[model samples]
Target: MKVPEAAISRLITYLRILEELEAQGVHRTSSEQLGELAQVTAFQVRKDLSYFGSYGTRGVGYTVPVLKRELRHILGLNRKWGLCIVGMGDLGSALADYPGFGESFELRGFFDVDPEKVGRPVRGGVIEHVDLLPQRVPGRIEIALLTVPREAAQKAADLLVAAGIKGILNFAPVVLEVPKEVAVENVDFLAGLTRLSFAILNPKWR
Candidate 1:
């Protein structure tokens, strides 16, 4: 069977817990202990880890730093990726200025369609026009946070893909069209609230 998408995320959570444990000089841990910190059952922890060729032995449990290393290796976070923001509108500017990015991602470029907005400053980099993506992408960016207007979003996304951008954090209202090779993560905060309401309404259905 394939690893659950949720299972992959749980490993990242467990990885952070291990790093904190290692920092405290705690070198080893059992599934039950890990589970409590991760807010999952011991069985779930064991099953999740087993999918990734686990580290814990029958009697020895798991070594903190070792598992942390394995988790980092598995999750494709060995190095930070260069990420850009398109649109430079309300949400785009907010994301660009937000400085809480992890070691796995770095803000590198900013883009916008409006000529008035272009050449202006937002975060670290001045806003460049959308047409400049191909020129700017080679060594500077591989991913884009697309916050363009719904009418212009598809064009913006196409530009991103053609520039060899591998991933897109799409925040547009409309669905985008991209090749299968490109990864798109649409962020819908309003729809998220709808999902939350449903979960609260149907407590036992989950």
Candidate 2:
């Protein structure tokens, strides 16, 4: 079934909560309980799960292990994905070394324009020049984590597209203009903070 972007976000959230429950030794949980943890209604939870298939047992609710496995498969967590970080600055380096990302996403390598940073070891691989992306990338990567500066974001995105990258996790503050085939997910920290500020200032907005 074709899923909405909002539903995909909530599914990821549910998977995280399921992981926490499993770690706490909780075996089974009801849709109501999942909804409470996810901050959504039980009906919403059931509707979301229905998009894939019936997973819950009537009266017995849902089995944590089974639900978790199904969710992982639905989110493509069942297979390993090759990821490369562009712009070897602080954020890029930190993401490359993060242990949590190592669970399902493999850090293939990194790309940067800095001559000093190039050819340097990062997350078990040497960083390559960003200019080499079109020549060296191709089949080696499936997703590009763009952590470059705002000014260079579009240029980096163009390079990724030219190199045949279809998926981009953009951390840069600017919106990217790519082909219809390329999927770009922008991570805007400032916008999130601005929303939080608005909610804080206007209690009714919350």
TM-score for all predictions?
A: 0.87, 0.96
Please report the candidate that would top lDDT against the real structure: 2
Candidate 2 clashing pairs? none
Residues 62-106 of candidate 2 have per-residue lDDT tens digits of: 999999999999999998887899999999999988988746888
* Count of steric clashes across candidates, in order: 0, 0
Candidate closest to the true structure, highest TM-score: 2
Deviating ranges (above 4 Å) for candidate 1: 23-25
lDDT of 1 by residue, 1-206 (tens): 67998998899899989989999999999899999999999998999888878677788899888888888888888888999998888988889888778888999888887888989977666988778888988887988898877888999888899998989998987789999999988898868888999999999995
Quote model 1's TM-score: 0.87
Stretches of candidate 2 exceeding 4 Å from the true structure: none
Give each prediction's root-mean-square deviation over alpha carbons: 2.2, 1.2
Give the Cα lDDT of each candidate: 0.87, 0.90
lDDT of 1 at 172: 85
Q: How many backbone clashes does candidate 1 have?
A: 0
